[PDB]
Structure formats: structure tokens, C-alpha cells
Write an enzyme that holds these catalytic residues in place. Sequence first.
Site, PDB file in Angstrom:
ATOM      1  N   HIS A  32      30.830  34.005  36.669  1.00 28.62           N
ATOM      2  CA  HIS A  32      32.119  33.767  36.046  1.00 28.62           C
ATOM      3  C   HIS A  32      32.008  33.896  34.533  1.00 28.62           C
ATOM      4  O   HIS A  32      30.975  33.571  33.946  1.00 28.62           O
ATOM      5  CB  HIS A  32      32.608  32.371  36.426  1.00 28.62           C
ATOM      6  CG  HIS A  32      32.295  31.996  37.841  1.00 28.62           C
ATOM      7  ND1 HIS A  32      31.511  30.910  38.166  1.00 28.62           N
ATOM      8  CD2 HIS A  32      32.648  32.570  39.014  1.00 28.62           C
ATOM      9  CE1 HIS A  32      31.392  30.833  39.479  1.00 28.62           C
ATOM     10  NE2 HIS A  32      32.072  31.828  40.018  1.00 28.62           N
ATOM     11  N   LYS A  50      40.006  37.063  40.528  1.00 28.71           N
ATOM     12  CA  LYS A  50      39.952  36.634  39.143  1.00 28.71           C
ATOM     13  C   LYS A  50      40.890  35.443  38.975  1.00 28.71           C
ATOM     14  O   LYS A  50      42.053  35.498  39.374  1.00 28.71           O
ATOM     15  CB  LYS A  50      40.369  37.791  38.228  1.00 28.71           C
ATOM     16  CG  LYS A  50      40.330  37.476  36.745  1.00 28.71           C
ATOM     17  CD  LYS A  50      40.489  38.751  35.923  1.00 28.71           C
ATOM     18  CE  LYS A  50      40.280  38.491  34.432  1.00 28.71           C
ATOM     19  NZ  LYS A  50      38.955  37.859  34.154  1.00 28.71           N
ATOM     20  N   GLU A  97      40.355  45.133  43.967  1.00 30.61           N
ATOM     21  CA  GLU A  97      39.403  45.916  44.736  1.00 30.61           C
ATOM     22  C   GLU A  97      37.993  45.364  44.503  1.00 30.61           C
ATOM     23  O   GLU A  97      37.553  45.224  43.360  1.00 30.61           O
ATOM     24  CB  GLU A  97      39.495  47.378  44.280  1.00 30.61           C
ATOM     25  CG  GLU A  97      38.541  48.340  44.963  1.00 30.61           C
ATOM     26  CD  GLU A  97      38.696  49.770  44.452  1.00 30.61           C
ATOM     27  OE1 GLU A  97      39.518  50.004  43.540  1.00 30.61           O
ATOM     28  OE2 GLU A  97      37.994  50.665  44.960  1.00 30.61           O
ATOM     29  N   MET A  99      34.216  45.458  44.051  1.00 31.85           N
ATOM     30  CA  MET A  99      33.289  46.486  43.599  1.00 31.85           C
ATOM     31  C   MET A  99      31.858  45.974  43.676  1.00 31.85           C
ATOM     32  O   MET A  99      31.338  45.400  42.719  1.00 31.85           O
ATOM     33  CB  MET A  99      33.629  46.903  42.166  1.00 31.85           C
ATOM     34  CG  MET A  99      35.045  47.439  42.003  1.00 31.85           C
ATOM     35  SD  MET A  99      35.255  49.099  42.690  1.00 31.85           S
ATOM     36  CE  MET A  99      35.445  48.774  44.410  1.00 31.85           C
ATOM     37  N   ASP A 149      39.064  49.544  24.593  1.00 33.06           N
ATOM     38  CA  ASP A 149      37.795  48.846  24.812  1.00 33.06           C
ATOM     39  C   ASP A 149      36.936  49.514  25.888  1.00 33.06           C
ATOM     40  O   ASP A 149      36.367  48.837  26.742  1.00 33.06           O
ATOM     41  CB  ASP A 149      38.080  47.388  25.199  1.00 33.06           C
ATOM     42  CG  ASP A 149      36.862  46.479  25.051  1.00 33.06           C
ATOM     43  OD1 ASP A 149      35.831  46.911  24.494  1.00 33.06           O
ATOM     44  OD2 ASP A 149      36.943  45.314  25.496  1.00 33.06           O
ATOM     45  N   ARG A 153      30.412  47.399  29.947  1.00 32.98           N
ATOM     46  CA  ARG A 153      30.692  46.047  30.442  1.00 32.98           C
ATOM     47  C   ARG A 153      32.047  45.993  31.155  1.00 32.98           C
ATOM     48  O   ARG A 153      32.302  45.081  31.944  1.00 32.98           O
ATOM     49  CB  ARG A 153      30.681  45.033  29.287  1.00 32.98           C
ATOM     50  CG  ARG A 153      31.844  45.203  28.310  1.00 32.98           C
ATOM     51  CD  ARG A 153      31.733  44.303  27.077  1.00 32.98           C
ATOM     52  NE  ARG A 153      32.620  44.768  26.008  1.00 32.98           N
ATOM     53  CZ  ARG A 153      32.257  45.642  25.071  1.00 32.98           C
ATOM     54  NH1 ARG A 153      31.030  46.135  25.072  1.00 32.98           N
ATOM     55  NH2 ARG A 153      33.118  46.040  24.147  1.00 32.98           N
ATOM     56  N   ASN A 154      32.910  46.970  30.879  1.00 36.97           N
ATOM     57  CA  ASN A 154      34.261  46.979  31.437  1.00 36.97           C
ATOM     58  C   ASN A 154      34.444  47.983  32.576  1.00 36.97           C
ATOM     59  O   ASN A 154      35.565  48.221  33.017  1.00 36.97           O
ATOM     60  CB  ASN A 154      35.288  47.258  30.334  1.00 36.97           C
ATOM     61  CG  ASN A 154      35.389  46.121  29.338  1.00 36.97           C
ATOM     62  OD1 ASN A 154      35.301  44.947  29.708  1.00 36.97           O
ATOM     63  ND2 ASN A 154      35.566  46.458  28.064  1.00 36.97           N
ATOM     64  N   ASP A 170      38.474  46.475  33.670  1.00 38.16           N
ATOM     65  CA  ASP A 170      39.010  45.434  32.793  1.00 38.16           C
ATOM     66  C   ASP A 170      39.958  46.028  31.752  1.00 38.16           C
ATOM     67  O   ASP A 170      39.672  47.065  31.155  1.00 38.16           O
ATOM     68  CB  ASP A 170      37.866  44.701  32.084  1.00 38.16           C
ATOM     69  CG  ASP A 170      38.362  43.635  31.118  1.00 38.16           C
ATOM     70  OD1 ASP A 170      38.831  43.989  30.012  1.00 38.16           O
ATOM     71  OD2 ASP A 170      38.279  42.437  31.459  1.00 38.16           O
TER      72      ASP A 170
HETATM   73  C1  LIG Z   1      37.301  40.946  37.104  1.00 36.02           C
HETATM   74  C2  LIG Z   1      35.917  41.422  37.585  1.00 36.02           C
HETATM   75  O1  LIG Z   1      36.167  42.211  38.803  1.00 36.02           O
HETATM   76  C3  LIG Z   1      35.142  42.523  39.704  1.00 36.02           C
HETATM   77  C4  LIG Z   1      33.787  42.137  39.573  1.00 36.02           C
HETATM   78  C5  LIG Z   1      32.764  42.470  40.486  1.00 36.02           C
HETATM   79  C6  LIG Z   1      33.202  43.240  41.590  1.00 36.02           C
HETATM   80  N1  LIG Z   1      34.514  43.646  41.778  1.00 36.02           N
HETATM   81  C7  LIG Z   1      35.472  43.294  40.846  1.00 36.02           C
HETATM   82  N2  LIG Z   1      36.800  43.724  41.048  1.00 36.02           N
HETATM   83  C8  LIG Z   1      31.352  42.022  40.219  1.00 36.02           C
HETATM   84  C9  LIG Z   1      30.703  41.738  38.936  1.00 36.02           C
HETATM   85  N3  LIG Z   1      29.426  41.366  39.091  1.00 36.02           N
HETATM   86  N4  LIG Z   1      29.217  41.397  40.407  1.00 36.02           N
HETATM   87  C10 LIG Z   1      27.894  41.040  40.895  1.00 36.02           C
HETATM   88  C11 LIG Z   1      30.318  41.779  41.153  1.00 36.02           C
HETATM   89  C12 LIG Z   1      30.310  41.879  42.585  1.00 36.02           C
HETATM   90  N5  LIG Z   1      30.324  41.980  43.738  1.00 36.02           N
HETATM   91  C13 LIG Z   1      31.231  41.801  37.509  1.00 36.02           C
HETATM   92  N6  LIG Z   1      31.960  40.574  37.012  1.00 36.02           N
HETATM   93  C14 LIG Z   1      31.354  39.265  37.313  1.00 36.02           C
HETATM   94  C15 LIG Z   1      33.192  40.551  36.260  1.00 36.02           C
HETATM   95  O2  LIG Z   1      33.754  39.518  35.869  1.00 36.02           O
HETATM   96  C16 LIG Z   1      33.906  41.816  35.884  1.00 36.02           C
HETATM   97  C17 LIG Z   1      33.275  42.619  34.877  1.00 36.02           C
HETATM   98  C18 LIG Z   1      33.870  43.831  34.454  1.00 36.02           C
HETATM   99  C19 LIG Z   1      35.087  44.245  35.023  1.00 36.02           C
HETATM  100  F1  LIG Z   1      35.638  45.391  34.615  1.00 36.02           F
HETATM  101  C20 LIG Z   1      35.739  43.474  36.020  1.00 36.02           C
HETATM  102  C21 LIG Z   1      35.171  42.232  36.484  1.00 36.02           C
END
Ligand SMILES: C[C@H]1Oc2cc(cnc2N)-c2c(nn(C)c2C#N)CN(C)C(=O)c2ccc(F)cc21
Length: 295
Positions: A32, A50, A97, A99, A149, A153-154, A170
Site C-alpha cells: 500500500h 485502490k 484490472e 496486473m 508523469d 513507477r506508473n 496511474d
Molecule cells: C493502483 C495500483 O494498481 C495495481 C497494482 C498492482 C496490480 N494491478 C493494479 N491495477 C500491483 C503492484 N504491485 N503488485 C505486486 C501488484 C500486484 N499484483 C503495484 N502497486 C502496489 C500500486 O499501488 C500501483 C503502482 C503503479 C500503478 F500504476 C498502479 C498501482
Amino acid sequence: NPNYCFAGKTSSISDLKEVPRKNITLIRGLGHGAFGEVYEGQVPLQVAVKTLPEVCSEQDELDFLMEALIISKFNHQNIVRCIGVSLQSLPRFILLEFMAGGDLKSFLRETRPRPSQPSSLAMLDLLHVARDIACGCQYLEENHFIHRDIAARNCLLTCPGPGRVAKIGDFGMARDIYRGGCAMLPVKWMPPEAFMEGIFTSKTDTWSFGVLLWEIFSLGYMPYPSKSNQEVLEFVTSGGRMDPPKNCPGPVYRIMTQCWQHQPEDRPNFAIILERIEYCTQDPDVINTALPIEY
Ligand SMILES: C[C@H]1Oc2cc(cnc2N)-c2c(nn(C)c2C#N)CN(C)C(=O)c2ccc(F)cc21
């Protein structure tokens, strides 16, 4: 309640797909942030959840709402889908979605070729990730959306293994600007006119994509190693640019340096970037180049 305009249509909170809270189960934390947690969830549809902290300001609420509107309005394979929202119960949820490959920076760092798995990644894998994100950026550009951005990381990956697809995941910066501080600005991803004048165009994202390319081909290094934000600001304003990442093919570095032209009009649009990335994938001397195995 706030409105959002994208392409030729205007949308409202009432347009978001509300999923009943009873249908949503949280599985595990995904790491988180410092504001809001992210979970793996189920609706049996697998999603990422989220969350909005219940302890938040009025502007925090609206920012969260705007992000949902922004993502729900896109329709492209290289931008994460929004499954829906759960805003009528607390804490509020945005469902995305799932990921499984995680974010791109962590993936690159965690999946660097190593003596244990020396072929964890190849040059063509990196070119495909870059192509995927460039395809998302082209979609944003032709729809006149400025991300502001673009950075590893995004970006997210559908899975760890060979069939992975990279997507922009993001949109918090574009959300902040749509309606903060100097030390929070991603200056290492920004062109001179952006951090000096606060001017943003599609050529802003072109510059940032160049920096993303460097992140990708360095396998997850922080841009401008050993330089602080202010040092980068002065370095870049004086014409300074990063050297090639270790083992980076010349055709790939050439794309980066074109993305970093001082004048925005001299930088390529994403249609041109995509064409050049595709030419790299065709060149055997590029894709037969070995990535550095860190010992
Ligand atoms: C809002 C968040 O969305 C997702 C996060 C993950 C998978 N799918 C989605 N949609 C995820 C992450 N790490 N891991 C291990 C998993 C898994 N499975 C990354 N993460 C913790 C983030 O906060 C993050 C970081 C960048 C970004 F662009 C969106 C997000």
C-alpha cells in the site's frame, strides 16, 4: 458533483459503474502507498482495489472521484481498465484490472538477469514493454490528453512471464492538475519548459517517455544517478543529458536523445517514436545484444 470531459463527451460520478460492496472480497495487500492501500480482490472476477482513507480531506475525496472518472473514460489496451467503483460504502473503492506483474520499476529490478536466471530478460522484452507504453501514449496524444508523469513507477504488467503486456496504470498527476510542492515534482522526468515555465504539451510526455526508456534499458535504475533534483534541473537546463544505459544499443539511445531535444518542436510525436521502436525490433544487432548480468 464534479464533471469530467474527455474526447467529445462529458461524464459525471453518476456515470461510474457502482459495484455492490457485498460482491467485493479483499484477498491480500499489494503493497500500500502512504495514502491509500491497494489490495488484490474479487468481485469470480480478479481485481485490484485502490482505497480512499476514511481519514481524508474534502479535496482528497474529489481527487479520488476524478481519478475514477479519468480512468473509466479511456478505451485502450495499454491503459489499465477500470472494472467499476464502490463509492457508496466506506472506505471508498476503485476497482482496476488486476496486473499480476506489478509495477514496471519493481519488475525490472526484481527480474534483472542474474547468475541464477541469466536469461530472465532479453533486449526484445524491453523493446516490447517500451512499444506497449508508447502505444498507450500515442492514444493519449491523439485524444489530446497530457499525462504529465510518464515513468516506470506508473506502469504495470499483466504478468511476470513472456506474454506480458505493459500498461499505464496511474493518472494521479493529470488528476491533480485537472482540479503539492517542489520536492514532490518529478523533475527528473520533466523537460525544461515544464519545470521552468510550467508549460505542458504532448511534447512534455515525449520528453518523459525518453526518461522512461532509460529506466527500462538500465533495468530499473533511478534517472541521473547520484544527482539531486536541483542538480538535474541545472544539468538539463544547460544541455546536459544522460549517458546510454549499460549495454544499450545505439539505435535505442538515439530515440532517447531525440525525445530529449531542448526545443519541444524538435522532438518526435508518438507515431514517430513507435515507428523507430519497431525498426529497433527488426534490427538483429539490436535484439541480439546481451543485457548485463549483475553479479
Ligand atoms: C493502483 C495500483 O494498481 C495495481 C497494482 C498492482 C496490480 N494491478 C493494479 N491495477 C500491483 C503492484 N504491485 N503488485 C505486486 C501488484 C500486484 N499484483 C503495484 N502497486 C502496489 C500500486 O499501488 C500501483 C503502482 C503503479 C500503478 F500504476 C498502479 C498501482
